[PDB]
Amino acid sequence: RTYLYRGRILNLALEGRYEIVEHKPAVAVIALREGRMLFVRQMRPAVGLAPLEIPAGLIEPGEDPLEAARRELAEETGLSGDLTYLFSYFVSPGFTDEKTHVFLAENLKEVEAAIEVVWMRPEEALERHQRGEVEFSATGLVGVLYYHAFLRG
Amino acid sequence: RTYLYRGRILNLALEGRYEIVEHKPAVAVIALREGRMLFVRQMRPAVGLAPLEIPAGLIEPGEDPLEAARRELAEETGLSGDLTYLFSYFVSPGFTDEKTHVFLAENLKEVEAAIEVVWMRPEEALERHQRGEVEFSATGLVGVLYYHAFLRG
Ligand SMILES: Nc1ncnc2c1ncn2[C@@H]1O[C@H](COP(=O)(O)OP(=O)(O)OC[C@H]2O[C@@H](O)[C@H](O)[C@@H]2O)[C@@H](O)[C@H]1O
Ligand SMILES: Nc1ncnc2c1ncn2[C@@H]1O[C@H](COP(=O)(O)OP(=O)(O)OC[C@H]2O[C@@H](O)[C@H](O)[C@@H]2O)[C@@H](O)[C@H]1O
Ligand SMILES: [Zn+2]
Ligand SMILES: [Zn+2]
Ligand SMILES: [Zn+2]
Ligand SMILES: [Zn+2]
Incomplete structure (x- = not known):
C-alpha cells in the first residue's frame, strides 16, 4: 500500500x-414533490459537462451519513425534510x-432563501436521457430508477 | 490539465x-432468468471486500459498448444473449x-463451460443488503432498482 x-x-x-x-464517503438525497424529483446540475470539470x-x-x-444528507440538501437547495436511509453503493x-x-x-x-436546482418529473428525465439530451450521474440514475420502482404508488 | x-x-x-x-469507459449487463438476476462477485482490493x-x-x-457488453457477459459468466442498450451514467x-x-x-x-457467479432474486439481494449482509456496487444496485421498476411484469 504505497502512496503516490x-x-x-x-x-x-x-x-x-x-x-x-x-x-x-458520500451521500445522496432522493426527494419527490408533486410528481417532480429534485435534481441538481453543476459544471463538472472531470467530464466537461453538467450531468x-x-x-x-x-x-x-465528525459527520455521519444522515447529518451530511441534511446539510447537502440545505446547502444545495435550501430545503430540509424528514430523511430515511435507503441503501448504499460503491461507485x-x-x-x-x-x-x-x-x-x-x-x-x-x-429553510433558506454554482448549483442549479432542477425539479423534473423522473419520467421526463429518463426520456431526455434516452434522447441523448442529458447525461446522468450515478446518483441521478439511482433516483430515477428508485422512483419508478417504489414511488409511483 | 497537468498529469501527475x-x-x-x-x-x-x-x-x-x-x-x-x-x-x-465501462459496460454493465442486467440479466434476469426465472426471477433471478445474474450478479457476480470478486475480491475488490480497493474496498477490501466482494460487493x-x-x-x-x-x-x-476498438470495441464499442455493445461489443464490450457481449464480451464481459461471456468472459465472466460463459453466457451470450440478445442485448439491448438501456442507459448510461457517470460513476x-x-x-x-x-x-x-x-x-x-x-x-x-x-456458450462456454476469480469471478463468482451469483444468481439471486433481486428481492433477496435488496433484503440482504438492508440487513447489512452484503454491499452493492453501483452496477449491482442499478440492476436491482431497474428490475423492481420495469421487470416484474
Ligand atoms: N475534483 C475535485 N478536486 C478537488 N476539490 C474538488 C473537486 N470537486 C469538487 N471539489 C471541492 O469540494 C467541495 C464540494 O464538496 P462536496 O460537498 O463533496 O460536493 P461535490 O463533490 O462537488 O459533488 C457531490 C457528489 O458527486 C460525486 O461526484 C461526489 O463524490 C459526491 O458524492 C467544493 O467546495 C470544491 O471546492
Ligand atoms: N485497480 C486496478 N489497477 C490496475 N489494474 C486493475 C485494477 N482492477 C482491475 N485491474 C485489471 O484489469 C482487468 C479487468 O478488466 P475489466 O474487464 O475492466 O474488469 P474489472 O475492472 O475488474 O470490473 C469491471 C467493472 O467494475 C468497475 O469497478 C469497473 O470500472 C468496471 O465498470 C483485470 O485483468 C486486472 O488485471
Ligand atoms: Zn469538504
Ligand atoms: Zn456540497
Ligand atoms: Zn483490458
Ligand atoms: Zn472482464
Whole structure:
C-alpha cells in the first residue's frame, strides 16, 4: 500500500498491481414533490459537462451519513425534510473506495432563501436521457430508477 | 490539465484546483432468468471486500459498448444473449470521467463451460443488503432498482 499522491478529496495509491484511489464517503438525497424529483446540475470539470444529479456531497469530519444528507440538501437547495436511509453503493469498486449512502427526503420545507436546482418529473428525465439530451450521474440514475420502482404508488 | 500519473486503468491529473482521474469507459449487463438476476462477485482490493455487482468491465480499444457488453457477459459468466442498450451514467462526475453503459440481456444461452457467479432474486439481494449482509456496487444496485421498476411484469 504505497502512496503516490495525497490530495484534497482523494489519494492515489498502489497495492501490488492494483491502482487504488481513496475517496471520502458520500451521500445522496432522493426527494419527490408533486410528481417532480429534485435534481441538481453543476459544471463538472472531470467530464466537461453538467450531468443530471440529485443533491449530494462528501461527508465532512465528525459527520455521519444522515447529518451530511441534511446539510447537502440545505446547502444545495435550501430545503430540509424528514430523511430515511435507503441503501448504499460503491461507485466503482474496481478502482476506488468511494461509498455513497442514499436517503429519501419527505415533507420538504424551504429553510433558506454554482448549483442549479432542477425539479423534473423522473419520467421526463429518463426520456431526455434516452434522447441523448442529458447525461446522468450515478446518483441521478439511482433516483430515477428508485422512483419508478417504489414511488409511483 | 497537468498529469501527475499515467497508469493501466487510470491517469491522475490536475485541472486548476480540481483533481481529476481519467478512466476508461465501462459496460454493465442486467440479466434476469426465472426471477433471478445474474450478479457476480470478486475480491475488490480497493474496498477490501466482494460487493454484489452484475457482469461488467472496461471497454477495450476498438470495441464499442455493445461489443464490450457481449464480451464481459461471456468472459465472466460463459453466457451470450440478445442485448439491448438501456442507459448510461457517470460513476462519480465530481472526480472521475468513468462512464458506464448499461445493457439488458435476454434469451441467455451457455456458450462456454476469480469471478463468482451469483444468481439471486433481486428481492433477496435488496433484503440482504438492508440487513447489512452484503454491499452493492453501483452496477449491482442499478440492476436491482431497474428490475423492481420495469421487470416484474
Ligand atoms: N485497480 C486496478 N489497477 C490496475 N489494474 C486493475 C485494477 N482492477 C482491475 N485491474 C485489471 O484489469 C482487468 C479487468 O478488466 P475489466 O474487464 O475492466 O474488469 P474489472 O475492472 O475488474 O470490473 C469491471 C467493472 O467494475 C468497475 O469497478 C469497473 O470500472 C468496471 O465498470 C483485470 O485483468 C486486472 O488485471
Ligand atoms: N475534483 C475535485 N478536486 C478537488 N476539490 C474538488 C473537486 N470537486 C469538487 N471539489 C471541492 O469540494 C467541495 C464540494 O464538496 P462536496 O460537498 O463533496 O460536493 P461535490 O463533490 O462537488 O459533488 C457531490 C457528489 O458527486 C460525486 O461526484 C461526489 O463524490 C459526491 O458524492 C467544493 O467546495 C470544491 O471546492
Ligand atoms: Zn456540497
Ligand atoms: Zn469538504
Ligand atoms: Zn472482464
Ligand atoms: Zn483490458
